[PDB]
Protein backbone atom coordinates (compact mmCIF):
# COMPACT_ATOMS: atom_id res chain seq x y z
CA UNK A 1 0.00 0.00 0.00
CA UNK A 2 1.01 3.74 0.44
CA UNK A 3 -0.14 5.11 3.94
CA UNK A 4 -1.36 8.49 2.61
CA UNK A 5 -4.16 8.93 5.16
CA UNK A 6 -4.22 11.00 8.32
CA UNK A 7 -4.33 9.69 11.96
CA UNK A 8 -7.48 7.68 12.85
CA UNK A 9 -8.18 6.06 16.26
CA UNK A 10 -8.42 2.23 16.24
CA UNK A 11 -11.75 0.38 16.11
CA UNK A 12 -12.01 -0.64 19.85
CA UNK A 13 -11.10 2.88 20.94
CA UNK A 14 -13.76 4.29 18.60
CA UNK A 15 -16.27 1.95 20.24
CA UNK A 16 -15.12 3.20 23.66
CA UNK A 17 -15.52 6.79 22.33
CA UNK A 18 -19.06 6.10 21.23
CA UNK A 19 -20.09 4.40 24.46
CA UNK A 20 -18.82 7.39 26.36
CA UNK A 21 -20.75 9.74 24.02
CA UNK A 22 -23.89 7.76 24.58
CA UNK A 23 -23.62 7.93 28.37
CA UNK A 24 -22.65 11.54 28.35
CA UNK A 25 -25.42 12.67 25.96
CA UNK A 26 -27.95 10.80 28.05
CA UNK A 27 -26.77 12.57 31.26
CA UNK A 28 -26.78 15.98 29.53
CA UNK A 29 -30.27 15.20 28.15
CA UNK A 30 -31.66 14.36 31.53
CA UNK A 31 -30.08 17.52 32.95
CA UNK A 32 -32.05 19.50 30.33
CA UNK A 33 -35.22 17.62 31.30
CA UNK A 34 -34.62 18.38 34.93
CA UNK A 35 -33.91 22.02 34.15
CA UNK A 36 -37.21 22.25 32.27
CA UNK A 37 -39.20 20.60 35.03
CA UNK A 38 -37.52 22.28 38.01
CA UNK A 39 -36.63 25.63 36.41
CA UNK A 40 -39.72 26.34 34.28
CA UNK A 41 -42.60 23.94 35.06
CA UNK A 42 -42.35 24.14 38.82
CA UNK A 43 -42.10 27.91 38.74
CA UNK A 44 -45.08 28.21 36.37
CA UNK A 45 -47.27 25.98 38.57
CA UNK A 46 -46.46 28.28 41.51
CA UNK A 47 -47.77 31.35 39.59
CA UNK A 48 -51.44 30.51 39.21
CA UNK A 49 -52.10 34.21 38.40
CA UNK A 50 -49.98 33.99 35.24
CA UNK A 51 -50.52 30.42 33.90
CA UNK A 52 -53.81 28.48 33.87
CA UNK A 53 -53.85 24.68 34.01
CA UNK A 54 -54.68 24.53 30.38
CA UNK A 55 -51.76 26.85 29.43
CA UNK A 56 -49.38 24.53 31.37
CA UNK A 57 -50.72 21.39 29.69
CA UNK A 58 -50.43 23.11 26.25
CA UNK A 59 -46.88 24.46 26.78
CA UNK A 60 -45.27 21.54 28.71
CA UNK A 61 -47.40 18.56 27.60
CA UNK A 62 -45.97 15.35 29.08
CA UNK A 63 -42.39 16.66 29.61
CA UNK A 64 -42.50 15.53 33.19
CA UNK A 65 -43.39 12.00 32.15
CA UNK A 66 -40.46 12.01 29.73
CA UNK A 67 -38.13 13.18 32.58
CA UNK A 68 -39.43 10.31 34.68
CA UNK A 69 -38.85 7.73 31.89
CA UNK A 70 -35.41 9.08 31.30
CA UNK A 71 -34.37 8.75 35.01
CA UNK A 72 -35.04 5.01 34.71
CA UNK A 73 -33.37 4.76 31.28
CA UNK A 74 -30.20 6.48 32.50
CA UNK A 75 -29.94 4.35 35.70
CA UNK A 76 -30.08 1.20 33.52
CA UNK A 77 -27.47 2.44 31.03
CA UNK A 78 -25.10 3.30 33.81
CA UNK A 79 -25.48 -0.18 35.29
CA UNK A 80 -24.20 -1.64 32.05
CA UNK A 81 -21.17 0.65 31.79
CA UNK A 82 -17.98 -1.37 32.21
CA UNK A 83 -15.45 0.80 34.22
CA UNK A 84 -12.58 -1.66 33.62
CA UNK A 85 -12.99 -1.74 29.84
CA UNK A 86 -15.60 0.73 28.48
CA UNK A 87 -15.60 -0.79 25.02
CA UNK A 88 -16.93 -4.03 26.46
CA UNK A 89 -20.09 -2.28 27.72
CA UNK A 90 -23.29 -3.94 26.45
CA UNK A 91 -26.08 -1.33 26.03
CA UNK A 92 -28.21 -2.89 23.42
CA UNK A 93 -30.48 -4.61 25.95
CA UNK A 94 -31.19 -1.29 27.73
CA UNK A 95 -32.86 0.07 24.63
CA UNK A 96 -34.70 -3.21 24.01
CA UNK A 97 -36.09 -3.48 27.55
CA UNK A 98 -37.33 0.17 27.50
CA UNK A 99 -38.81 0.14 23.98
CA UNK A 100 -42.50 0.61 24.84
CA UNK A 101 -41.65 3.47 27.09
CA UNK A 102 -40.30 5.48 24.11
CA UNK A 103 -43.93 5.75 22.86
CA UNK A 104 -44.49 8.73 25.23
CA UNK A 105 -42.51 10.77 22.65
CA UNK A 106 -45.48 10.38 20.23
CA UNK A 107 -47.74 12.54 22.30
CA UNK A 108 -44.90 15.06 22.80
CA UNK A 109 -44.30 15.46 19.02
CA UNK A 110 -48.01 15.52 18.15
CA UNK A 111 -48.60 18.47 20.48
CA UNK A 112 -45.42 20.43 20.00
CA UNK A 113 -46.55 23.03 17.51
CA UNK A 114 -49.52 24.05 19.80
CA UNK A 115 -46.79 24.56 22.46
CA UNK A 116 -44.84 26.79 20.11
CA UNK A 117 -48.07 28.68 19.22
CA UNK A 118 -48.89 29.40 22.87
CA UNK A 119 -45.35 30.43 23.82
CA UNK A 120 -45.10 32.87 20.90
CA UNK A 121 -48.33 34.43 22.09
CA UNK A 122 -47.05 34.78 25.63
CA UNK A 123 -43.70 36.15 24.50
CA UNK A 124 -45.42 39.32 23.07
CA UNK A 125 -46.02 40.35 26.64
CA UNK A 126 -43.07 41.60 28.66
CA UNK A 127 -44.46 40.13 31.94
CA UNK A 128 -43.79 36.61 30.53
CA UNK A 129 -40.58 37.40 28.66
CA UNK A 130 -39.10 38.59 31.96
CA UNK A 131 -40.50 35.69 33.93
CA UNK A 132 -39.12 33.15 31.50
CA UNK A 133 -35.71 34.91 31.40
CA UNK A 134 -35.65 34.84 35.20
CA UNK A 135 -36.32 31.07 35.27
CA UNK A 136 -33.54 30.47 32.80
CA UNK A 137 -30.96 32.56 34.78
CA UNK A 138 -31.81 30.83 38.05
CA UNK A 139 -31.67 27.35 36.65
CA UNK A 140 -28.26 28.36 35.14
CA UNK A 141 -29.15 27.25 31.56
CA UNK A 142 -27.38 28.49 28.36
CA UNK A 143 -28.92 31.39 26.49
CA UNK A 144 -31.43 29.50 24.36
CA UNK A 145 -34.99 30.40 25.19
CA UNK A 146 -37.61 27.99 26.56
CA UNK A 147 -38.94 27.07 23.10
CA UNK A 148 -35.49 25.72 22.13
CA UNK A 149 -35.25 23.64 25.25
CA UNK A 150 -38.74 22.19 24.66
CA UNK A 151 -37.49 21.00 21.27
CA UNK A 152 -34.84 18.72 22.82
CA UNK A 153 -37.07 15.58 23.25
CA UNK A 154 -37.94 15.84 19.52
CA UNK A 155 -34.28 16.05 18.56
CA UNK A 156 -33.42 13.33 20.97
CA UNK A 157 -35.87 10.69 19.67
CA UNK A 158 -34.41 11.30 16.20
CA UNK A 159 -30.75 11.05 17.42
CA UNK A 160 -30.82 7.49 18.87
CA UNK A 161 -30.78 5.64 15.56
CA UNK A 162 -27.70 7.62 14.58
CA UNK A 163 -25.91 6.92 17.78
CA UNK A 164 -26.70 3.27 17.68
CA UNK A 165 -25.56 3.05 13.98
CA UNK A 166 -22.23 4.61 14.95
CA UNK A 167 -21.93 2.09 17.80
CA UNK A 168 -22.67 -0.77 15.40
CA UNK A 169 -20.09 0.37 12.87
CA UNK A 170 -17.36 -0.08 15.56
CA UNK A 171 -18.65 -3.36 17.01
CA UNK A 172 -17.13 -6.65 15.78
CA UNK A 173 -19.53 -9.44 14.62
CA UNK A 174 -18.52 -11.68 17.67
CA UNK A 175 -19.03 -8.93 20.34
CA UNK A 176 -21.50 -9.97 23.10
CA UNK A 177 -23.38 -6.74 22.01
CA UNK A 178 -23.36 -7.08 18.12
CA UNK A 179 -26.75 -8.69 17.63
CA UNK A 180 -28.23 -6.70 20.56
CA UNK A 181 -27.01 -3.39 19.11
CA UNK A 182 -28.27 -4.35 15.67
CA UNK A 183 -31.71 -5.18 17.16
CA UNK A 184 -31.76 -2.01 19.22
CA UNK A 185 -31.00 0.07 16.09
CA UNK A 186 -33.88 -1.59 14.27
CA UNK A 187 -36.20 -1.06 17.22
CA UNK A 188 -35.35 2.63 17.66
CA UNK A 189 -35.62 3.40 13.88
CA UNK A 190 -39.07 1.82 14.07
CA UNK A 191 -40.06 3.94 17.10
CA UNK A 192 -39.23 7.09 15.26
CA UNK A 193 -40.81 6.02 11.98
CA UNK A 194 -43.96 5.05 13.84
CA UNK A 195 -44.03 8.45 15.65
CA UNK A 196 -43.66 10.23 12.30
CA UNK A 197 -46.43 8.04 10.74
CA UNK A 198 -48.89 8.50 13.69
CA UNK A 199 -48.36 12.24 13.34
CA UNK A 200 -48.97 12.16 9.57
CA UNK A 201 -52.13 10.13 10.17
CA UNK A 202 -53.53 12.67 12.64
CA UNK A 203 -52.63 15.63 10.38
CA UNK A 204 -54.23 14.03 7.26
CA UNK A 205 -57.73 13.39 8.79
CA UNK A 206 -58.63 16.84 7.51
CA UNK A 207 -57.45 15.78 4.01
CA UNK A 208 -59.52 12.63 4.00
CA UNK A 209 -62.73 14.74 4.70
CA UNK A 210 -61.76 17.23 1.94
CA UNK A 211 -61.04 14.46 -0.62
CA UNK A 212 -64.38 12.85 0.10
CA UNK A 213 -66.14 16.25 -0.36
CA UNK A 214 -64.50 16.65 -3.84
CA UNK A 215 -65.79 13.25 -5.08
CA UNK A 216 -69.17 13.54 -6.89
CA UNK A 217 -72.26 11.37 -6.20
CA UNK A 218 -71.01 10.13 -2.83
CA UNK A 219 -73.12 7.26 -1.41
CA UNK A 220 -73.04 5.82 2.07
CA UNK A 221 -71.24 6.91 5.23
CA UNK A 222 -68.26 9.24 5.59
CA UNK A 223 -64.98 7.47 5.27
CA UNK A 224 -64.03 8.71 8.77
CA UNK A 225 -66.81 6.59 10.24
CA UNK A 226 -64.59 3.52 9.85
CA UNK A 227 -61.16 4.57 8.55
CA UNK A 228 -58.45 7.15 9.36
CA UNK A 229 -55.64 6.40 6.86
CA UNK A 230 -55.20 6.15 3.09
CA UNK A 231 -52.79 3.28 2.57
CA UNK A 232 -52.58 3.17 -1.23
CA UNK A 233 -54.31 4.30 -4.38
CA UNK A 234 -54.11 3.86 -8.12
CA UNK A 235 -55.78 2.59 -11.22
CA UNK A 236 -56.85 -1.00 -11.88
CA UNK A 237 -59.36 -2.75 -14.11
CA UNK A 238 -61.85 -5.05 -12.32
CA UNK A 239 -64.74 -7.48 -12.79
CA UNK A 240 -67.41 -7.37 -10.07
CA UNK A 241 -68.97 -10.77 -10.89
CA UNK A 242 -68.15 -13.76 -13.16
CA UNK A 243 -68.99 -13.03 -16.84
CA UNK A 244 -69.40 -9.33 -15.93
CA UNK A 245 -68.02 -6.34 -17.79
CA UNK A 246 -64.40 -5.27 -17.13
CA UNK A 247 -64.54 -1.62 -15.87
CA UNK A 248 -61.47 0.68 -15.35
CA UNK A 249 -61.55 2.30 -11.88
CA UNK A 250 -59.40 4.34 -9.40
CA UNK A 251 -59.19 2.48 -6.07
CA UNK A 252 -58.55 4.02 -2.68
CA UNK A 253 -57.49 1.56 0.05
CA UNK A 254 -58.15 2.82 3.55
CA UNK A 255 -58.00 0.78 6.78
CA UNK A 256 -61.18 -1.36 6.84
CA UNK A 257 -62.46 -0.37 3.33
CA UNK A 258 -61.58 0.16 -0.35
CA UNK A 259 -63.47 2.83 -2.30
CA UNK A 260 -63.68 2.79 -6.07
CA UNK A 261 -64.29 5.75 -8.38
CA UNK A 262 -64.45 6.51 -12.12
CA UNK A 263 -62.67 9.46 -13.72
CA UNK A 264 -64.84 11.65 -15.97
CA UNK A 265 -63.97 10.93 -19.62
CA UNK A 266 -62.99 14.61 -20.34
CA UNK A 267 -62.18 16.22 -17.01
CA UNK A 268 -59.58 13.84 -15.58
CA UNK A 269 -59.46 15.51 -12.13
CA UNK A 270 -63.22 14.82 -11.54
CA UNK A 271 -64.02 11.51 -9.78
CA UNK A 272 -67.41 9.77 -9.43
CA UNK A 273 -68.18 7.54 -6.46
CA UNK A 274 -68.80 3.99 -7.68
CA UNK A 275 -68.96 1.94 -4.45
CA UNK A 276 -66.76 0.30 -1.90
CA UNK A 277 -65.53 -3.08 -0.61
CA UNK A 278 -65.54 -3.88 3.10
CA UNK A 279 -62.01 -5.23 3.64
CA UNK A 280 -62.90 -6.92 7.06
CA UNK A 281 -65.03 -9.40 5.00
CA UNK A 282 -62.50 -9.98 2.13
CA UNK A 283 -59.41 -12.23 1.83
CA UNK A 284 -56.84 -11.55 -0.84
CA UNK A 285 -56.26 -14.58 -3.08
CA UNK A 286 -53.10 -14.14 -5.20
CA UNK A 287 -53.88 -15.51 -8.67
CA UNK A 288 -51.27 -16.91 -11.01
CA UNK A 289 -50.88 -15.98 -14.70
CA UNK A 290 -52.70 -17.85 -17.50
CA UNK A 291 -56.44 -18.63 -17.65
CA UNK A 292 -59.20 -18.43 -15.06
CA UNK A 293 -61.95 -20.93 -14.15
CA UNK A 294 -65.58 -19.76 -14.69
CA UNK A 295 -64.83 -16.68 -14.17
CA UNK A 296 -63.64 -17.91 -17.66
CA UNK A 297 -61.25 -15.13 -18.80
CA UNK A 298 -57.51 -14.87 -19.47
CA UNK A 299 -55.15 -12.97 -17.17
CA UNK A 300 -51.93 -10.96 -16.90
CA UNK A 301 -51.11 -9.34 -13.50
CA UNK A 302 -54.12 -10.54 -11.59
CA UNK A 303 -55.50 -11.21 -8.12
CA UNK A 304 -58.83 -11.89 -6.49
CA UNK A 305 -60.84 -10.87 -3.42
CA UNK A 306 -62.96 -13.72 -1.96
CA UNK A 307 -65.65 -13.07 0.68
CA UNK A 308 -64.83 -15.04 3.86
CA UNK A 309 -68.37 -16.35 4.66
CA UNK A 310 -70.04 -16.18 1.13
CA UNK A 311 -69.07 -17.41 -2.38
CA UNK A 312 -68.65 -13.68 -3.52
CA UNK A 313 -65.59 -12.93 -5.67
CA UNK A 314 -63.99 -10.01 -7.56
CA UNK A 315 -61.16 -10.07 -10.14
CA UNK A 316 -58.55 -7.27 -10.34
CA UNK A 317 -56.00 -6.54 -13.10
CA UNK A 318 -52.97 -4.25 -12.72
CA UNK A 319 -50.97 -3.35 -15.87
CA UNK A 320 -47.32 -3.91 -14.83
CA UNK A 321 -45.98 -6.62 -12.44
CA UNK A 322 -44.60 -3.74 -10.30
CA UNK A 323 -48.27 -2.74 -9.71
CA UNK A 324 -49.75 -6.16 -8.74
CA UNK A 325 -46.94 -6.46 -6.18
CA UNK A 326 -47.48 -2.88 -4.83
CA UNK A 327 -51.19 -3.69 -4.26
CA UNK A 328 -50.55 -7.01 -2.52
CA UNK A 329 -48.27 -5.16 -0.08
CA UNK A 330 -50.98 -2.49 0.42
CA UNK A 331 -53.45 -5.30 1.33
CA UNK A 332 -51.06 -7.06 3.76
CA UNK A 333 -50.47 -3.49 5.06
CA UNK A 334 -54.15 -2.74 5.74
CA UNK A 335 -54.70 -6.10 7.53
CA UNK A 336 -51.51 -5.25 9.52
CA UNK A 337 -52.68 -1.74 10.43
CA UNK A 338 -56.13 -3.02 11.46
CA UNK A 339 -54.71 -5.68 13.87
CA UNK A 340 -52.30 -3.22 15.55
CA UNK A 341 -55.09 -0.61 15.90
CA UNK A 342 -57.78 -2.74 17.51
CA UNK A 343 -54.95 -4.26 19.68
CA UNK A 344 -53.93 -0.79 20.91
CA UNK A 345 -57.45 0.62 20.90
CA UNK A 346 -56.53 3.44 18.49
CA UNK A 347 -59.75 5.36 17.96
CA UNK A 348 -60.06 8.62 16.13
CA UNK A 349 -61.43 11.25 18.52
CA UNK A 350 -64.94 12.65 18.39
CA UNK A 351 -63.75 16.26 18.30
CA UNK A 352 -61.15 15.20 15.66
CA UNK A 353 -64.06 14.26 13.38
CA UNK A 354 -65.82 17.57 14.25
CA UNK A 355 -62.63 19.51 13.30
CA UNK A 356 -62.12 17.72 9.98
CA UNK A 357 -65.79 18.05 9.04
CA UNK A 358 -65.76 21.76 9.99
CA UNK A 359 -63.02 22.29 7.33
CA UNK A 360 -65.48 21.06 4.65
CA UNK A 361 -68.02 23.79 5.62
CA UNK A 362 -65.20 26.40 5.14
CA UNK A 363 -65.09 25.72 1.37
CA UNK A 364 -68.94 26.07 1.12
CA UNK A 365 -71.27 23.18 2.18
Amino acid sequence: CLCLGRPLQNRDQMRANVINEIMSTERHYIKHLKDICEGYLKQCRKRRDMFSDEQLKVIFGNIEDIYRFQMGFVRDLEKQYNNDDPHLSEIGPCFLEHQDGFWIYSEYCNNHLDACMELSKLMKDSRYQHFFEACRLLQQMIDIAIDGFLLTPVQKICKYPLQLAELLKYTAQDHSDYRYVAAALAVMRNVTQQINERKRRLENIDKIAQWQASVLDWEGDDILDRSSELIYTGEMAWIYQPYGRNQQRVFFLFDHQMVLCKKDLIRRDILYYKGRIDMDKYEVIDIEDGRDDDFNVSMKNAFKLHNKETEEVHLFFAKKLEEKIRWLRAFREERKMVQEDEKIGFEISENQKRQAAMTVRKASK
Binding site: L4, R6, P7, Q9, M14, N17, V18, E21, T25, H28, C109, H112, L113, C116, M117, S120, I142, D143, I144, A145, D147, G148, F149, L151, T152, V154, Q155, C158, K159, Y160, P161, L162, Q163, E166, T192, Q193, I195, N196, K199, R200, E203
Partner: protein, 187 residues
Protein backbone atom coordinates in the same frame (compact mmCIF):
# COMPACT_ATOMS: atom_id res chain seq x y z
CA UNK B 1 -30.66 40.87 24.14
CA UNK B 2 -31.46 40.02 20.53
CA UNK B 3 -31.09 36.53 19.10
CA UNK B 4 -30.41 34.92 15.80
CA UNK B 5 -31.74 31.36 15.50
CA UNK B 6 -29.79 29.55 12.82
CA UNK B 7 -30.94 26.06 11.70
CA UNK B 8 -28.77 23.73 9.61
CA UNK B 9 -30.66 21.43 7.24
CA UNK B 10 -29.77 19.03 4.48
CA UNK B 11 -29.23 15.38 3.72
CA UNK B 12 -27.84 12.88 6.15
CA UNK B 13 -24.08 12.27 6.19
CA UNK B 14 -23.13 15.55 4.58
CA UNK B 15 -21.31 16.69 7.71
CA UNK B 16 -23.96 19.02 9.24
CA UNK B 17 -23.01 18.14 12.75
CA UNK B 18 -19.26 18.05 12.10
CA UNK B 19 -19.58 21.59 10.83
CA UNK B 20 -21.35 22.80 13.98
CA UNK B 21 -18.96 20.96 16.24
CA UNK B 22 -15.91 22.30 14.45
CA UNK B 23 -17.24 25.91 14.51
CA UNK B 24 -18.05 25.89 18.25
CA UNK B 25 -15.15 23.90 19.76
CA UNK B 26 -11.44 24.07 19.24
CA UNK B 27 -10.45 20.44 18.81
CA UNK B 28 -7.35 18.91 17.37
CA UNK B 29 -8.38 17.10 14.20
CA UNK B 30 -7.28 13.69 15.66
CA UNK B 31 -9.81 13.95 18.49
CA UNK B 32 -13.08 12.07 18.43
CA UNK B 33 -16.00 13.89 16.83
CA UNK B 34 -19.39 13.26 18.47
CA UNK B 35 -22.23 12.09 16.25
CA UNK B 36 -24.58 14.51 18.07
CA UNK B 37 -24.57 18.30 18.59
CA UNK B 38 -26.66 19.89 21.38
CA UNK B 39 -28.33 23.29 20.84
CA UNK B 40 -25.60 25.93 21.36
CA UNK B 41 -25.65 29.64 22.17
CA UNK B 42 -22.82 32.11 21.66
CA UNK B 43 -22.40 35.81 21.85
CA UNK B 44 -21.27 37.48 18.65
CA UNK B 45 -20.58 41.19 18.26
CA UNK B 46 -21.90 43.28 15.39
CA UNK B 47 -22.10 47.00 15.18
CA UNK B 48 -20.31 46.90 18.52
CA UNK B 49 -23.42 45.34 20.09
CA UNK B 50 -23.77 41.78 21.46
CA UNK B 51 -26.14 39.24 19.83
CA UNK B 52 -26.77 35.68 20.87
CA UNK B 53 -26.41 33.27 18.00
CA UNK B 54 -28.44 30.09 18.62
CA UNK B 55 -27.29 27.06 16.57
CA UNK B 56 -29.61 24.13 15.96
CA UNK B 57 -28.69 20.85 14.13
CA UNK B 58 -31.35 18.66 12.47
CA UNK B 59 -29.32 15.41 12.35
CA UNK B 60 -31.21 12.17 12.12
CA UNK B 61 -34.39 14.00 11.01
CA UNK B 62 -33.89 13.56 7.25
CA UNK B 63 -36.46 10.77 6.76
CA UNK B 64 -39.09 12.17 9.18
CA UNK B 65 -41.07 14.72 7.21
CA UNK B 66 -43.57 15.47 9.94
CA UNK B 67 -40.96 15.94 12.72
CA UNK B 68 -38.57 18.18 10.77
CA UNK B 69 -40.84 21.23 10.72
CA UNK B 70 -40.98 21.36 14.51
CA UNK B 71 -37.53 22.93 14.34
CA UNK B 72 -38.48 25.72 11.96
CA UNK B 73 -40.51 28.33 14.03
CA UNK B 74 -38.47 31.38 15.11
CA UNK B 75 -35.72 30.68 12.56
CA UNK B 76 -33.92 33.85 11.29
CA UNK B 77 -31.59 32.06 8.88
CA UNK B 78 -31.18 28.56 7.45
CA UNK B 79 -28.04 26.92 6.25
CA UNK B 80 -28.99 24.52 3.45
CA UNK B 81 -26.06 22.09 3.36
CA UNK B 82 -24.94 19.61 0.77
CA UNK B 83 -21.63 17.78 0.38
CA UNK B 84 -19.54 18.84 -2.68
CA UNK B 85 -18.58 15.16 -2.95
CA UNK B 86 -22.25 13.90 -2.96
CA UNK B 87 -24.16 14.79 -6.10
CA UNK B 88 -27.37 13.24 -4.74
CA UNK B 89 -27.20 15.64 -1.74
CA UNK B 90 -26.89 18.53 -4.19
CA UNK B 91 -29.89 17.34 -6.21
CA UNK B 92 -31.86 17.21 -2.96
CA UNK B 93 -31.15 20.87 -2.25
CA UNK B 94 -33.35 21.57 -5.25
CA UNK B 95 -35.88 18.76 -5.03
CA UNK B 96 -36.42 18.68 -1.26
CA UNK B 97 -34.77 21.23 1.09
CA UNK B 98 -35.32 24.59 -0.57
CA UNK B 99 -39.01 23.84 -1.40
CA UNK B 100 -39.61 22.63 2.21
CA UNK B 101 -38.15 25.60 4.05
CA UNK B 102 -39.68 28.14 1.60
CA UNK B 103 -43.10 26.47 2.05
CA UNK B 104 -42.81 26.76 5.88
CA UNK B 105 -40.73 29.93 6.15
CA UNK B 106 -41.30 31.90 2.94
CA UNK B 107 -39.61 35.14 4.14
CA UNK B 108 -36.62 33.58 5.91
CA UNK B 109 -33.20 33.90 4.24
CA UNK B 110 -31.05 30.88 3.53
CA UNK B 111 -27.52 30.21 2.42
CA UNK B 112 -26.43 27.39 0.23
CA UNK B 113 -23.49 25.72 2.01
CA UNK B 114 -21.13 23.28 0.33
CA UNK B 115 -19.43 20.96 2.89
CA UNK B 116 -16.53 18.47 2.90
CA UNK B 117 -14.46 20.46 0.39
CA UNK B 118 -11.33 18.65 1.61
CA UNK B 119 -12.79 15.46 0.12
CA UNK B 120 -12.27 16.86 -3.44
CA UNK B 121 -8.65 15.88 -2.93
CA UNK B 122 -9.24 12.51 -1.22
CA UNK B 123 -8.12 9.54 -3.35
CA UNK B 124 -10.92 7.19 -2.17
CA UNK B 125 -13.76 9.66 -2.52
CA UNK B 126 -12.67 10.48 -6.07
CA UNK B 127 -12.34 6.83 -7.02
CA UNK B 128 -15.76 5.91 -5.57
CA UNK B 129 -17.54 8.78 -7.38
CA UNK B 130 -15.76 7.90 -10.63
CA UNK B 131 -17.01 4.28 -10.35
CA UNK B 132 -20.49 5.72 -10.91
CA UNK B 133 -19.21 8.19 -13.56
CA UNK B 134 -19.64 11.09 -11.13
CA UNK B 135 -17.37 13.72 -9.81
CA UNK B 136 -17.60 16.44 -7.16
CA UNK B 137 -19.78 19.53 -7.48
CA UNK B 138 -17.93 22.56 -8.70
CA UNK B 139 -18.31 26.05 -7.04
CA UNK B 140 -19.53 27.46 -10.36
CA UNK B 141 -22.40 24.89 -10.66
CA UNK B 142 -23.38 25.62 -7.06
CA UNK B 143 -23.28 29.41 -7.52
CA UNK B 144 -25.64 28.90 -10.38
CA UNK B 145 -28.08 26.91 -8.26
CA UNK B 146 -27.87 29.48 -5.44
CA UNK B 147 -28.86 32.24 -7.85
CA UNK B 148 -31.72 30.17 -9.34
CA UNK B 149 -33.10 29.26 -5.95
CA UNK B 150 -32.81 32.77 -4.38
CA UNK B 151 -30.17 31.88 -1.75
CA UNK B 152 -28.55 34.91 -0.24
CA UNK B 153 -25.37 33.24 -1.44
CA UNK B 154 -23.14 30.21 -1.87
CA UNK B 155 -20.39 29.54 0.69
CA UNK B 156 -18.13 26.51 0.97
CA UNK B 157 -16.18 25.04 3.92
CA UNK B 158 -14.25 22.12 5.40
CA UNK B 159 -15.08 21.29 9.04
CA UNK B 160 -11.78 19.32 9.10
CA UNK B 161 -9.27 22.01 8.04
CA UNK B 162 -11.59 24.90 8.87
CA UNK B 163 -11.10 26.47 5.42
CA UNK B 164 -14.03 28.85 4.95
CA UNK B 165 -15.67 27.73 8.18
CA UNK B 166 -15.92 30.98 10.20
CA UNK B 167 -17.07 32.81 7.02
CA UNK B 168 -20.05 30.50 6.63
CA UNK B 169 -21.29 31.68 9.99
CA UNK B 170 -20.38 35.38 9.51
CA UNK B 171 -22.36 35.32 6.25
CA UNK B 172 -25.24 33.63 8.08
CA UNK B 173 -25.27 36.36 10.73
CA UNK B 174 -25.22 39.10 8.05
CA UNK B 175 -28.08 37.50 6.05
CA UNK B 176 -30.11 37.38 9.31
CA UNK B 177 -29.67 41.05 10.20
CA UNK B 178 -29.53 42.73 6.77
CA UNK B 179 -32.19 45.47 6.98
CA UNK B 180 -38.07 40.00 12.79
CA UNK B 181 -40.27 40.07 9.74
CA UNK B 182 -37.76 37.61 8.23
CA UNK B 183 -38.25 35.36 11.29
CA UNK B 184 -40.24 32.16 10.60
CA UNK B 185 -43.64 31.94 12.34
CA UNK B 186 -46.67 29.64 12.90
CA UNK B 187 -47.19 27.11 10.10
Amino acid sequence: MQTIKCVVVGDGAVGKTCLLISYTTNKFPSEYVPTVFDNYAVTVMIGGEPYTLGLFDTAGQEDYDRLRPLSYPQTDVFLVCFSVVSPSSFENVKEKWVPEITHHCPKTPFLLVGTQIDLRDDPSTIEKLAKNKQKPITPETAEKLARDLKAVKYVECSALTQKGLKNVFDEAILAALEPKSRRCVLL
